[PDB]
């Protein structure tokens with residue numbers, strides 16, 4: 120009956136709200152007051168939600184959904200039939216939840232110590248080392264040490280995790296966990312579409328890579344940089360070499376056009392975590408988008424707590440499933456990177472608020488990439504010299520300043536493309552059994568080489584598990600969403616710049632206060648997961664494909680500059 124599928128999704132919706140709230144409830148209380156008290160309540164909440172998932176998922180499975188007339192109801196029920204981990208038998212479920220928890224915990228408490236000297240955590244201590252050291256051996260120490268202590272300690276967990284995550288996926292009708300993850304895009308052509316997009320950004324990436332390598336050669340010495348080879352992975356200013364803007368100082372196109380210390384000026388002006396998020400909120404509301412509610416301000420955690428209570432520090436945005444309570448937890452450092460991340464997280468919150476009246480099953484982004492993209496869009500405008508100046512973080516003109524800013528943007532946006540691409544290429548092949556525990560690491564480095572053109576500064580040996588040194592691997596968060604985000608964020612920016620009436624070069628656009636730009640975003644965000652994502656894309660951009668052409672157009676002046684510069688020096692693009 121049509122009416123009985125209707126009643127079912129109504130009940131699911133009512134009961135999911137309550138149960139999901141309680142779990143987000145408990146999970147929050149844990150994350151922002153790790154104790155074994157909150158940790159014991161979290162465990163009990165895990166079983167509660169698994170038990171509701173099972174109850175509802177079993178019932179949803181009894182609907183012959185072909186026969187379902189209403190498309191929203193068909194779509195909700197189809198999703199409820201996926202139990203996720205709740206599909207597992209009781210034993211396996213217990214052990215998977217515990218694997219996830221032990222992996223996350225291992226990663227987040229791992230420290231690197233000098234022999235009778237200090238122990239360094241990943242944030243801020245090792246992150247700052249990677250960002251600011253210019254000494255090969257000091258970078259290597261932090262780079263190797265992090266892998267020694269985080270990645271190797273993940274390895275004892277990973278095989279069992281893969282086994283249980285694949286098992287849950289097969290139990291929900293997928294072939295393996297990767298297949299389950301890719302199905303979030305509802306795009307049978309996903310893998311080839313992503314490949315084409317990655318191929319489109321190779322000229323820009325290869326030219327960026329070659330110019331950066333020559334600049335490293337100049338700093339680190341001819342004996343340590345091969346001008347036709349991969350770059351050693353510890354020299355890019357970032358623990359994973361996944362963004363390169365901390366070595367802007369070594370690579371500036373035009374040293375003659377100096378620019379302000381963004382970080383120093385924020386500090387210099389006593390920016391706090393709160394001002395950072397307040398500025399993010401202001402940008403959202405300038406677009407006519409929704410302000411975060413008063414509750415957000417009361418309950419969010421915007422900086423490492425100081426009552427000596429212990430917390431999980433990775434920036435994250437939280438929906439509590441009651442249409443009222445949305446939160447961010449981030450141990451905000453006062454710097455440029457973190458201001459972007461504030462925007463990133465605030466984009467998540469905006470989406471939560473835009474779709475909060477849908478059925479919970481439809482409360483997701485049009486695809487995971489759209490969710491990751493929202494904040495970054497706003498942040499592209501934020502990073503303009505024009506905007507940074509309006510916030511009193513830059514002094515201003517020239518072609519030089521322009522090429523300098525593009526370079527700064529490139530070391531964030533372009534460098535991340537291969538990295539964000541390779542992560543799930545690796546995991547997809549682990550999940551499908553192509554990569555086994557005997558070759559996790561070797562296959563990671565194959566992809567690190569093939570896609571990013573990087574090599575490990577020291578030989579890896581059996582027992583290393585470098586992937587486990589990147590948060591999302593032990594936390595089991597899919598990563599392709601970030602490669603998608605990075606492409607479609609420039610298309611969004613181009614479309615909103617167009618809505619806003621900007622003309623001339625795309626990278627000069629700043630959509631601050633554009634109500635036309637807000638309306639495009641709001642309409643798409645309001646859809647949630649109610650319609651195939653090409654419809655949200657078409658709402659924003661007027662067409663329905665993912666496309667690198669906007670990112671290319673944004674970067675085109677930099678492409679020309681890098682070609683001229685690379686050609687002048689005879690660079691050989693790539694790493695034979």
Ligand SMILES: *[C@@H]1O[C@H](CO[C@@H]2O[C@@H](C)[C@@H](O)[C@@H](O)[C@@H]2O)[C@@H](O[C@@H]2O[C@H](CO)[C@@H](O[C@@H]3O[C@H](CO[C@H]4O[C@H](CO)[C@@H](O)[C@H](O)[C@@H]4O[C@@H]4O[C@H](CO)[C@@H](O)[C@H](O)[C@H]4NC(C)=O)[C@@H](O)[C@H](O[C@H]4O[C@H](CO)[C@@H](O)[C@H](O)[C@@H]4O[C@@H]4O[C@H](CO)[C@@H](O)[C@H](O)[C@H]4NC(C)=O)[C@@H]3O)[C@H](O)[C@H]2NC(C)=O)[C@H](O)[C@H]1NC(C)=O
Pocket residue numbers: 125126128129132189190191192442475476477478479649
């Ligand atoms: C197939 O089924 C789907 C699903 O049906 C729904 O779910 C199933 C399981 C059954 O329960 C159904 O009975 C139930 O209808 C059908 O899709 C639905 O179709 C109707 C319209 O035909 C849509 O109604 C719109 O709903 C929005 C918002 O909905 C929520 O939020 C409101 C405000 O917060 C609140 O008033 C509602 O009660 C509702 O509540 C939420 O419900 C979800 C669960 O569904 C729950 O999880 C939430 O927690 C809960 N929220 C709260 C607060 O508790 C509503 O805003 C719309 O109003 C406008 O639309 C009318 C039509 O044009 C218009 O006459 C009104 O004046 C009003 O106008 C607009 O108002 C705006 C803003 O103020 C204004 O700017 C505009 O100018 C104005 N527009 C005009 C005049 O053009 C509206 O009623 C449902 O959204 C929709 N559900 C979804 C998400 O798909 C589908 O129709 C069926 N298909 C077929 C083949 O028939």
Ligand SMILES: C[C@H](N[C@H](C(=O)O)[C@@H]1CCCN1C(=O)[C@@H](N)Cc1ccccc1)C(=O)N1CCC[C@H]1C(=O)O
Pocket residue numbers: 433434435436437460463464467483484490491596601
């Ligand atoms: C810091 C940023 N943090 C993430 C993040 O915000 O995504 C955190 C951790 C990963 C999940 N996450 C969240 O906050 C989610 N609750 C977001 C979400 C998931 C599903 C549905 C809706 C919303 C991040 O890792 N980033 C940011 C860019 C690159 C990547 C990285 O650091 O490697």
Ligand SMILES: *[C@@H]1O[C@H](CO)[C@@H](O)[C@H](O)[C@H]1NC(C)=O
Pocket residue numbers: 152154156157426428
């Ligand atoms: C932290 O946890 C303990 C045990 O759950 C609790 O009693 C205490 O109130 C919490 N502290 C804060 C500040 O939330």
Ligand SMILES: [Cl-]
Pocket residue numbers: 359585586588
């Ligand atoms: Cl690595």
Ligand SMILES: [Cl-]
Pocket residue numbers: 300303487488597598599600601
């Ligand atoms: Cl994803």
Ligand SMILES: [Zn+2]
Pocket residue numbers: 463464467490491
């Ligand atoms: Zn995110």
